[PDB]
Amino acid sequence: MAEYIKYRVPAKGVSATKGVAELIEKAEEEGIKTAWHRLLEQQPQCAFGQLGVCCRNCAMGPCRIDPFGSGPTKGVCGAGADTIVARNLLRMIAAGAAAHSDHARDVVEVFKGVAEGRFQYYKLTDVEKLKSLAETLGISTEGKDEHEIARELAEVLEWEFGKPGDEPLRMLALAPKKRIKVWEKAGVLPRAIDREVCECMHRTHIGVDADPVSLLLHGIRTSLADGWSGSMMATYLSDILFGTPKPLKAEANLGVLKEDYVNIVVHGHNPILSTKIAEIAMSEEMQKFAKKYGAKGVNVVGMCCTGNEVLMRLGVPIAGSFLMQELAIITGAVEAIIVDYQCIMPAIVDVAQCYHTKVITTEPKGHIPGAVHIEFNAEKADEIAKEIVRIAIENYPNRPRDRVHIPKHKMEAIAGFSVEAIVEALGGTLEPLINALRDGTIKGIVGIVGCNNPKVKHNYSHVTLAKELIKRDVLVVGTGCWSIAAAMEGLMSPKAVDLAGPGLKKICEALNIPPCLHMGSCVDCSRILIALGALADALGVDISDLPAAGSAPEWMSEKAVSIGTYFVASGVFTHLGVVPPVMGSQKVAKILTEDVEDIIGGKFYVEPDPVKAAETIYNVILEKRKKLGWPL
Amino acid sequence: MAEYIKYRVPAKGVSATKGVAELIEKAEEEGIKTAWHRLLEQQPQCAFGQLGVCCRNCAMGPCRIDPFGSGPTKGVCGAGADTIVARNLLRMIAAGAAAHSDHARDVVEVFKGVAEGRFQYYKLTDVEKLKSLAETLGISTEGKDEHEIARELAEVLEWEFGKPGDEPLRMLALAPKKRIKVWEKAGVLPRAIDREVCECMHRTHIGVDADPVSLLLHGIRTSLADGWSGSMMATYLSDILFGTPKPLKAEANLGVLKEDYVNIVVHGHNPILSTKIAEIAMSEEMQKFAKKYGAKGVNVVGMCCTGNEVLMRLGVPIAGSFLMQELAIITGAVEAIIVDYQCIMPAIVDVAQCYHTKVITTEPKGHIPGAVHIEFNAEKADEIAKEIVRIAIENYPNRPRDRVHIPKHKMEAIAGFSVEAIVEALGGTLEPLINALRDGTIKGIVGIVGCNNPKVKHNYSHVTLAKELIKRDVLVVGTGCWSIAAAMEGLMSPKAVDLAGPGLKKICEALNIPPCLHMGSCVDCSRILIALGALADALGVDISDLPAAGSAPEWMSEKAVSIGTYFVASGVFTHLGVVPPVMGSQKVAKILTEDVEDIIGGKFYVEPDPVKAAETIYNVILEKRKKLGWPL
Ligand code: SF4
Ligand code: SF4
Ligand code: FES
Ligand code: FES
């Protein structure tokens, strides 16, 4: 059962959100390893892999390149350090784009089934978004039923994954003509998403593409296939199926788990499952079932991006971010955690085996040995959701109440700020915020996104960067676990305006919004690309000229690499708070942080310090203001 | 210029083909590093990577799993050794399938351009193959022009890469119904190739698929998308465009390079380029151009799989296999080496910079820094080929004749044994070879394929396994660098029958074929799958019941991993002569070499010794004979 913890985690400085330390210590006293303990067990981590100068692409390896110059400078094949670093980064981009593309593909399948009248458990709820998106891609809407429009749109979207021509992706019709011309001159226009992923897997194959420039340019093309198509399709279809998010209020942090209620966690990414689970479990049938089993009711909380989806659409309380999933089971009050795929730590099974908690996997692509697999499908969605919630409610009597410790800490957060909601907040036009940017009332906008990584202090960089930006009158928007961190800290509560500078304070009180805008999940970074795209278009300007920046302060996933790359390729200066494994090559490092600005108009900037990164981002914003002839 | 060689390669036992030792020593005395020297510089290679128990799939890594049990047993995410090994192998399968799929995609593009009447430099030469393949996939041929049939076929083939349904790949119509039912029960039927590659990249993403069984089953599905579709399309369309190979004779080994002729090497994989280069350079215009430049003419030789393509179709002499590419430049007589993609050592540029040799890259996916890029396209194919051959001929005067050493060693080889050619050799029916298998005149058939790897003796396992099999009356067929090795040794010369056993000797003299059948390039392993598929179907039998085996004695590429996996999945016992990086996990090792036989009917078997592997393969063949009620 219990395990010997070899190295203990100094808990008082491990995290920036209240409750994480208590639960790490509870795990220690129970002998349960978390991600921090295993990170400590991994150290020292291999320097060659950390710098990206180790390749395992063929059986003649593994090969190490010594950047000291002490030992070997070339692999068995002859690959230098530049080639190996660029290829490994290309495969990271491929994997992130692939994750987002499979997400989009599942939502496309459900949307097409609804267009044909097959999945009657799912609606076309935003017919306006459907018609406008169909018109944007060249589909006439008038004279047609909603479902026929949806059928034609679905046919085009299905084809985004594998169309055979060298014509650009259809969804690129959402990108401004300036970005279009930039990508055309650079030759990075994506053609079909799965083809881009497969071509990266081919280029990195031994003896194919050894040039860092071409490798990274195709990485740019693949990231664009992700952001402006795959993730974009995911967001647009999730809005069409479950509603475009509008501003609402909810609760954040692990204080949302209840003592006298069945606690059901929804963890993962695809809302096709989580929306059904939440609606079924907060239905009154399951409420009285839980009362029959000795509870006051059923409380469903969310974690990570599927939690963000249910938070933005239904107001479901979000319990925590990435590195907190384990900790949620260590509260001792989780009857069941329902997962689909992406960023589901396998360790959550181990942890769950020291309690009563059931780890329910539901998707054929997300298997974890030891879990209980109840496969979800669209046609019998409500029945599977009922069965799952029933299993959780029936496990409720097994909760070891003697080992329950839920941290009190709970925070209010205003979420649901899609681009449509933001434009509605401005009176239906972009003009007031544009005037605020031109005056200097708002210096700029910064999108903060990304994961958690135990190599940096938990959620510290997220919140510190957000604070330092909003205090300098910079409107902060963001997605993902950054948004979970900001919500748990209080940066999205109605009083968060207190920490903003004078101009941001005045405008947030003039529009009744917080100074930090939760724009949704990791695929909802596409929303950011729309927002900037609108701004740049309203000002007769490219995205690269906007006084704006992006940041991933604590990233860890290959999805984050794809997101940062397509931010750069979209022309936004993009900061990384975790050092990508590229420092083993000077050429690749300067391409990433320098040479690529001339090509597409954005670039990377590595800085693990949140305050330093805030100063650099603010200086870049001031530079873009000076280039725009604006006041500073 | 020259380099200090830190460790010298014992050349007298380095290889099994004559001439390799002399050229390794010439490289040493010139200070030019080959793959062997850099392999020596890499040792000791990291044990964790060698056993597959090191993962770099996220920024929380790199993570090592200690199979000793000394240190950490789980990664930061919680992934055990089984998960990490299975995921890394899945990405190898993804990369190999992707390489073969991009190859097929380029040939599909050219074939579709010819169907529309656009690339008039390319013909429909095998209209019979075109019509039969179109009928096999449900396209009626009668009443239609050749080009219209080709258009409909191309539409179906284009869709193999990205069709949106969960329906199986169309090309699976070439697989027997028994394999169909096996794959259906296992649930590994491939749907769309690029989707399979992208789904592997998604499953191996952090926190998605952690179960080794599901990971490896999707690897099986992806390998099937490669072998029975992508590689199959590549082979079928290459035959339709450039002719189905028929038996012919040619020369092998580095003795085919001439002293008084311009020497042009074609290296790579896609014949769209190499056929044009060979035809243009052996045209009389370039012959008199080379005479004007002081040479007797132009001699074009091939290396690796594109060399195998031009060898099977035109009789172009093949100069060597994988590990010999560098050595070909060290002869000092190569005016130009023309490469497209796949297994092009970047080091060949370095080596070429110590001579006059020009490394010409021609494909947008195959860039090598320092090379000269003359991009090839179908519409201006003949003009680009003329320009390239002219550059080689004009470089001829720069050959340092003082530093020229071409090994005399040259061997005759009978190549061009496609399935059609083999059936034509048997009188148009499969009955004589089936009778020979039933009698015991031929014990079985074994396909030998794969790469070269300097960790094992060069070409030694290829030739030794082929010899040990044919001496026990086992018909040896094979592709790729195994076929180059067999051709250079003499196992495909008319006298090779001398080394065969009595039954194989009698039947090869009765049909005037060698005991070793060159069936083409790495994609032409699809031919093998057809052959077995025919045999199994003629006997009313599954492929798994045939007295047959496959082997990759010296593999190194991820393409080889995909090929071996889809051989296994096709039901053939498949031997590996190089240990895959899986031994860090007992569960994955037993799935690969044991548990998977119950699922699909084949399995892996690791044995780096060629004689041991020959005995095991022969015993498995005898087992399959006993199960068939045949004599032993
Ligand atoms: S691709 Fe080259 S550098 Fe990478 S492992 Fe293979 S031989 Fe070594
Ligand atoms: S996926 Fe897991 S095992 Fe692999 S590097 Fe990431 S944290 Fe370590
Ligand atoms: S030697 Fe450490 S990542 Fe390969
Ligand atoms: S530690 Fe050697 S392959 Fe990663």
Q: Note whether residue B459 is domain-resident.
A: yes
Tokens of B196: 């399979």
**Test the A interface: residue of B50, B208, B361, B556 with most A CBs within 10 Å:** B208
Nearest to A307 by CA among A247, A253, A229, A382: A253
Q: Give the residue from chain B lying closest to A166, CA to CA.
A: B109
Could you give the dihedral angle defined by the CA atoms of residues B438, B442, B443 and B448, in that order, rounded to the nearest 10 degrees? -130
Query: B200: alpha, beta or left, given left = phi > 0 and alpha = psi -120 to 50?
Result: alpha
Q: How far apart are the first and last CA of chain A?
A: 62
**Distance of alpha carbon A160 from alpha carbon A155, whole angstroms:** 9
Q: Does ligand 1 come within 6 angstroms of the Cβ of A58?
A: yes
The identity of residue B527, as a single letter, is: R
* Residue B235 CB partners (closer than 8 Å, separation 6+): B520, B523, B524, B526, B527
Indicate whether A99 and A232 sit together in one domain. yes
State the DSSP string of B561-579.
Answer: HHHHHHHHHTT--EEESS-
For residue A342, give the nearest of B99, B163, B208 by CB distance: B208
Indicate whether A118 and A251 sit together in one domain. no
Q: Is residue B258 exposed (0-12), middle (13-18) or buried (19+ Cβ within 10 Å)?
A: middle
* Residue B22 CB partners (closer than 8 Å, separation 6+): B11, B405, B407
The reply to whether residue B210 touches residue A369, judged by beta carbons under 8 angstroms, is yes
**Distance of alpha carbon B87 from alpha carbon A137, whole angstroms:** 38
Nearest to B341 by CA among B305, B378, B299, B292: B305
The reply to whether residue A50 touches residue B72, judged by beta carbons under 8 angstroms, is no
Helices B231-242, B146-162: inter-axial angle, 10-degree rounding: 160
* Residue B355 CB partners (closer than 8 Å, separation 6+): B329, B332, B334, B400, B403
How many CA atoms lie less than 13 Å away from A46 in the CB half-sphere? 21
Buried/exposed A103-140: b ≥16 CB within 10 Å, e otherwise:
bbbbbbbbbbbbbeeebebbebebeebbbebbeebebe
- Which residues are registered as beta bridge partners of A249? A414
For residue B194, give the nearest of A39, A71, A198 by CB distance: A198
Indicate whether A524 and A554 sit together in one domain. yes
Q: Note whether residue A556 is domain-resident.
A: yes
Query: What range does the domain containing A270 cover?
Result: 246-416
Nearest to B35 by CA among A83, A61, A49: A61
With contact defined as beta carbons under 8 Å apart, do A401 and A238 qualify? Answer: no
3-state DSSP: chain B helix, strand, coil percent, rounded to 5? 50, 10, 35
With contact defined as beta carbons under 8 Å apart, do A413 and A250 qualify? Answer: yes
φ and ψ of B419, to 5 deg: -60, -40
Indicate whether A403 and A481 sit together in one domain. no
3-state DSSP: chain A helix, strand, coil percent, rounded to 5? 50, 10, 35
Q: Note whether residue A577 is domain-resident.
A: yes
- Which residues are registered as beta bridge partners of B575? B551, B605
Nearest to A576 by CA among A545, A555, A603, A600: A555
**Distance of alpha carbon B213 from alpha carbon B600, whole angstroms:** 13
Pairing of strands A63-64, A54-55: antiparallel
With contact defined as beta carbons under 8 Å apart, do A275 and A300 qualify? Answer: no
With contact defined as beta carbons under 8 Å apart, do B40 and A60 qualify? Answer: no
At which of B416, B447, B480 does a domain end? Answer: B416
Q: Note whether residue A490 is domain-resident.
A: yes
**Distance of alpha carbon B284 from alpha carbon B282, whole angstroms:** 6
DSSP-based three-state secondary structure for A64: strand
**Distance of alpha carbon B607 from alpha carbon B593, whole angstroms:** 11
* Residue A606 CB partners (closer than 8 Å, separation 6+): A575, A576, A579, A580, A593
How many CA atoms lie less than 13 Å away from B432 in the CB half-sphere? 15
* Residue B106 CB partners (closer than 8 Å, separation 6+): B270, B272
Pairing of strands B336-339, B358-361: parallel
DSSP class of A592:
I
Nearest to B571 by CA among B602, B598, B545: B602
φ and ψ of A319, to 5 deg: -90, -25
The identity of residue A507, as a single letter, is: I
* Residue A464 CB partners (closer than 8 Å, separation 6+): A16, A610, A611, A614
Long-range contacts of B38-42 (CB under 8 A, 24+ apart): B38/A72, B38/A74, B38/A75, B38/A76, B38/A78, B38/B347, B39/A60, B39/A76, B39/B454, B39/B455, B40/B6, B40/B7, B40/B9, B41/A71, B41/A72, B41/B6, B41/B7, B42/A61, B42/A62, B42/A63, B42/A64, B42/A72, B42/A75, B42/A76
For ligand 2, atom 6, which residue shows the shortest CA distance?
B58
3-state secondary structure B504-553: HHHHHHHHCCCCEEECCCCCCHHHHHHHHHHHHHHCCCCHHHCCEEEEEC
Residues of A in contact with B587 (CB under 8 A): none
The reply to whether residue B346 touches residue A49, judged by beta carbons under 8 angstroms, is no
Indicate whether A383 and A509 sit together in one domain. no
Residue with tokens 């050894």: A210
Residue ranges of the binding site of A for [2Fe-2S] cluster: 46, 54, 56, 64
Q: Is the dihedral of CA A415, A420, A422, A424 positive or negative?
A: negative
With contact defined as beta carbons under 8 Å apart, do A547 and A625 qualify? Answer: yes
Residue with tokens 């790199």: B62
Which value, in Å, is the radius of gyration of the alpha carbons in chain B?
24
How many CA atoms lie less than 13 Å away from A371 in the CB half-sphere? 27
> C-alpha A359: how far from its chain's center?
22
Residue B457: C-alpha distances to residues B17, B339, B518, B582, B593 (Å): 10, 26, 22, 22, 24
**Distance of alpha carbon B557 from alpha carbon A205, whole angstroms:** 8
B578 interface with A at CB cutoff 8 Å: yes
A631 interface with B at CB cutoff 8 Å: no
Helix (H) or strand (E) holding B211: none
**Distance of alpha carbon A384 from alpha carbon A386, whole angstroms:** 5
Q: Note whether residue B123 is domain-resident.
A: yes
**Test the A interface: residue of B206, B345, B373 with most A CBs within 10 Å:** B206
Query: B190: alpha, beta or left, given left = phi > 0 and alpha = psi -120 to 50?
Result: beta
**Distance of alpha carbon A195 from alpha carbon A201, whole angstroms:** 10
Give me the count of residues in chain A: 632
| Experimental resolution (Å) | 2.4
Query: How many residue pairs from chains A and B have C-beta atoms closer than 8 A?
Result: 305
With contact defined as beta carbons under 8 Å apart, do A304 and A267 qualify? Answer: yes
Separation of A60 CA from ligand 3 center, angstroms? Answer: 14
Indicate whether A232 and A255 sit together in one domain. no
B72 interface with A at CB cutoff 8 Å: yes
**Distance of alpha carbon A431 from alpha carbon A435, whole angstroms:** 6
Q: Give the residue from chain A lying closest to B581, CA to CA.
A: A59
Residues of B in contact with A368 (CB under 8 A): 210-211
Which value, in Å, is the radius of gyration of the alpha carbons in chain A?
24
Nearest to A105 by CA among A232, A240, A234: A234
Please give the angle made by the CA atoms of A476, A482 and A483, to the nearest 5 degrees. Answer: 70
User: How many domains does chain A fold into?
Assistant: 3
With contact defined as beta carbons under 8 Å apart, do A69 and A588 qualify? Answer: no
Strand order in the sheet with A474-478: A516-518, A474-478, A444-448, A548-552, A574-576, A604-606
φ and ψ of A302, to 5 deg: -120, 155
Tokens of B300: 């074009």
Instruction: Give residue ranges with CB within 6 A of ligand 4.
Output: A 46, 49, 54, 56, 62; B 46, 48-49, 54, 62, 64
Nearest to A591 by CA among A560, A563, A569: A569
Neighbours of B450 (CB within 10 A): 31
φ and ψ of A111, to 5 deg: -65, -40
Which A residues in the span 488-547 are in contact with B, Cβ-Cβ below 8 Å?
none
**Distance of alpha carbon A306 from alpha carbon B523, whole angstroms:** 42
The reply to whether residue B207 touches residue A39, judged by beta carbons under 8 angstroms, is no
Respond yes or no on whether the N-terminal peptide bond of residue B397 is cis (omega within 30° of 0): no
Please give the angle made by the CA atoms of B353, B357 and B358, to the nearest 5 degrees. Answer: 90
Nearest to A578 by CA among A527, A613, A547: A613
Pairing of strands B318-320, B297-303: parallel
DSSP class of A294:
T
The reply to whether residue A194 touches residue B83, judged by beta carbons under 8 angstroms, is no
Method used to obtain the model: X-ray
Nearest to B42 by CA among B579, B455, B461: B455
Residue with tokens 């002719």: B243
Indicate whether B253 and B327 sit together in one domain. yes
Helix (H) or strand (E) holding A55: strand A54-55
Residues of B in contact with A162 (CB under 8 A): 159, 161-164, 192, 194-195
**Distance of alpha carbon A400 from alpha carbon A149, whole angstroms:** 52
With contact defined as beta carbons under 8 Å apart, do A93 and A562 qualify? Answer: yes
At which of B213, B230, B245 does a domain end? Answer: B245
Indicate whether B188 and B332 sit together in one domain. no
DSSP-based three-state secondary structure for B345: coil
Could you give the dihedral angle defined by the CA atoms of residues A314, A319, A325 and A331, in that order, rounded to the nearest 10 degrees? -130
Helix (H) or strand (E) holding B445: strand B444-448
At which of B355, B386, B416 does a domain end? Answer: B416
Neighbours of B136 (CB within 10 A): 14
Q: Is residue A35 exposed (0-12), middle (13-18) or buried (19+ Cβ within 10 Å)?
A: buried
Q: Note whether residue A535 is domain-resident.
A: yes
Q: Tell me which of B54, B55, B92 to substitute to probe ligand 4's pocket, judged by most ligand atoms within 8 Å of the beta carbon.
A: B54
Pairing of strands B548-552, B444-448: parallel
The identity of residue B346, as a single letter, is: P
Helix (H) or strand (E) holding A570: none
**Distance of alpha carbon A256 from alpha carbon A233, whole angstroms:** 32
Residue B528: C-alpha distances to residues B104, B448, B518, B519, B563 (Å): 17, 10, 11, 8, 11
Q: Note whether residue B35 is domain-resident.
A: no
Q: Note whether residue A57 is domain-resident.
A: no
**Distance of alpha carbon B94 from alpha carbon A98, whole angstroms:** 12
Nearest to B63 by CA among B42, B79, B50, B86: B79
For ligand 4, atom 1, which residue shows the shortest CA distance?
A46
State the DSSP string of A219-283.
Answer: HHHHHHHIIIIIHHHHHHHHHHHH-----EEEEESGGGS-SSEEEEEEEES-HHHHHHHHHHHTS
For the CA of A47, the nearest atom of ligand 3 = 2
Helix (H) or strand (E) holding B298: strand B297-303
Please give the angle made by the CA atoms of A28, A29 and A33, to the nearest 5 degrees. Answer: 30
Q: Give the residue from chain A lying closest to B343, CA to CA.
A: A207
**Distance of alpha carbon A316 from alpha carbon B111, whole angstroms:** 54
Tokens of B617: 């393969």
Residues of B in contact with A35 (CB under 8 A): 60, 76-78
**Distance of alpha carbon B307 from alpha carbon B324, whole angstroms:** 13
With contact defined as beta carbons under 8 Å apart, do B134 and B153 qualify? Answer: yes
**Test the A interface: residue of B205, B354, B377, B558 with most A CBs within 10 Å:** B205
Indicate whether B163 and B308 sit together in one domain. no
Neighbours of A370 (CB within 10 A): 14
DSSP-based three-state secondary structure for B7: coil
Residue with tokens 């999108």: A447
Residue with tokens 């290959």: A558
Residue with tokens 């449900």: B138
Q: Is the dihedral of CA B473, B474, B475, B481 positive or negative?
A: negative
Alpha helices in B211-346 (DSSP H): 212-225, 231-242, 271-281, 284-292, 304-314, 325-330
Indicate whether B562 and B453 sit together in one domain. yes
The reply to whether residue A102 touches residue B198, judged by beta carbons under 8 angstroms, is yes
**Distance of alpha carbon A508 from alpha carbon A53, whole angstroms:** 47
Long-range contacts of A287-292 (CB under 8 A, 24+ apart): A289/A389, A289/A390, A289/A393, A290/A261, A290/A262, A290/A393, A290/A396
- Which residues are registered as beta bridge partners of A166? none
φ and ψ of B306, to 5 deg: -65, -35
DSSP class of A14:
S
Tokens of A249: 């209020």
Pairing of strands A604-606, A574-576: parallel
Indicate whether B624 and B611 sit together in one domain. yes
Indicate whether A426 and A455 sit together in one domain. yes
Nearest to A417 by CA among A324, A271, A312: A312
Tokens of A513: 């919004």
Residue B619: C-alpha distances to residues B500, B578, B615 (Å): 18, 20, 6
CA distance A2 to chain B (A): 15
**Distance of alpha carbon B62 from alpha carbon A50, whole angstroms:** 7
Which B residues in the span 329-348 are in contact with A, Cβ-Cβ below 8 Å?
341-348
